[PDB]
């Protein structure tokens, strides 16, 4: 019932600007210290910025005068404006609530948003089917999936049957190919007798390009 939802973020060219926002639900951020904390891919947590309950702003050495933290009390939203972004700035940025009066820690976070600073251009993914085969598949269980290939940048979100199929679903992490584009797969295991009567659609979402793909995976016969 208490949430911090972050929006903004995606592909940004070096030297370009971006603005991230963090909407609070269930409380007023005007009564707490607020913080932005980043994490580069496969690395640790790096403190970025803090805003006070009075409005006082503290920044880090590497981001002094380059970033700007703010909050709108009417809209009850935190903001981070980034202006001179470099390649070492690509990271997942998190919005967090600091409880200095009791915990002296961070008691509330939001899901991160990925900011990618690169000179490459945005490209949508191709979604091919990993079709289930005949009833020669390790008994009564079958394997099917979707191959999401040739997209940029991260991230991509996959789901099955609009979120109705979750068990036995594996969405693999993305792999950077030689071409500079990403590629992954998402597989799900189902009972073999489900094929033919139950439909299986993977839902690929690529917000950096505002692209959404729904591919119905159907069995491939023999003959």
């Amino acid at each position: 019932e208490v949430q911090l939802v972050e929006s903004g973020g995606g592909l940004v060219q070096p030297g370009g600007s971006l603005r991230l926002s963090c909407a609070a639900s269930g409380f007023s951020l005007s009564s707490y210290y607020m913080t932005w904390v980043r994490q580069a891919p496969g690395k640790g947590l790096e403190w970025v910025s803090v805003i006070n309950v009075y409005g006082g702003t503290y920044y880090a050495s590497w981001a002094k005068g380059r970033f700007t933290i703010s909050r709108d009390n009417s809209k009850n939203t935190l903001y981070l404006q980034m202006n001179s972004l470099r390649a070492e700035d690509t990271a997942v940025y998190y919005c967090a609530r600091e409880d200095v009066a009791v915990y002296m820690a961070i008691d509330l976070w939001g899901q991160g948003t990925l900011v990618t600073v690169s000179s490459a251009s945005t490209k949508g993914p191709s979604v091919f089917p990993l079709a289930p085969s005949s009833k020669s598949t390790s008994g009564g269980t079958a394997a099917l999936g979707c191959l999401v290939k040739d997209y940029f940048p991260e991230p991509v979100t996959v789901s099955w049957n609009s979120g109705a199929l979750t068990s036995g679903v594996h969405t693999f992490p993305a792999v950077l190919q030689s071409s500079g584009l990403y590629s992954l797969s998402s597989v799900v295991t189902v009972p073999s007798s489900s094929l033919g009567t139950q439909t299986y659609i993977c839902n690929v979402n690529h917000k950096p390009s505002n692209t959404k793909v729904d591919k119905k995976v159907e069995p491939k016969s023999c003959g």
Partner: protein, 216 residues
């Protein structure tokens, strides 16, 4: 100007072992140190605040202790759902002069008994062949340990420098893994052959799943 030295970077243990993470402060932060846990794709969750105080809804097998500038997070009985990365956060007063410092992080893998994967193989679809590229994917579902020798054969000829592998994070229930091996070729190289196979070797066992073009 304060730094948090966390140790170790990673560690493996079995279900029930007692594991210890240490955090060293550059100066003295008094008690303003907190421990957090982060699972893949998720934001960290506050485990411990003020060095040795438990949070709301955190099991008692997580404990925190202080000795001057050395802080210790202990998991008394490791459970299959503790697979994560653990961080310490120390704040010198108000955070000024980089007073807010995170630790380097500790990735906690889980040791369990060997489990064999279920191996599936998917040929490239015709929709993908229309574009002059073929990706054949070999899936390894629910295996342990993460180590696995996945090789590709085309007409019983071994391939190298031609595929890419991707591993899931350790399952939060049965501490298992899933692996995908994608072998990429041109349309011509795919038409030049018939029998394709991936062989997974896991110790003394090596199971090969195959398919031949055209026939089924």
């Amino acid at each position: 100007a304060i730094q948090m030295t966390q140790s170790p970077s990673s560690l493996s243990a079995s279900v029930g072992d007692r594991v210890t993470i240490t955090c060293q402060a550059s100066q003295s932060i008094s008690n303003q140190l907190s421990w957090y846990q982060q699972k893949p794709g998720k934001a960290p969750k506050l485990l411990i605040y003020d060095a040795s105080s438990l949070a709301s809804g955190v099991p008692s097998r997580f404990s925190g202790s202080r000795s001057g500038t050395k802080f210790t997070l202990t998991i008394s009985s490791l459970q299959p759902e503790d697979f994560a990365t653990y961080y310490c956060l120390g704040i010198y007063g108000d955070g000024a002069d980089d007073g807010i410092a995170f630790g380097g992080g500790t990735k906690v893998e889980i040791k369990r008994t060997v489990a064999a994967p279920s191996v599936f193989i998917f040929p490239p679809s015709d929709e993908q062949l229309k574009s002059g590229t073929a990706s054949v994917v070999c899936l390894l579902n629910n295996f342990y340990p993460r180590e696995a020798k996945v090789q590709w054969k085309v007409d019983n000829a071994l391939q190298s420098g031609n595929s890419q592998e991707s591993v899931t994070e350790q399952d939060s229930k049965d501490s298992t893994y899933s692996l995908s091996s994608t072998l990429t070729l041109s349309k011509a190289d795919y038409e030049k052959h018939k029998v394709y196979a991936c062989e997974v070797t896991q110790g003394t066992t090596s199971v090969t799943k195959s398919f031949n073009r055209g026939e089924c």
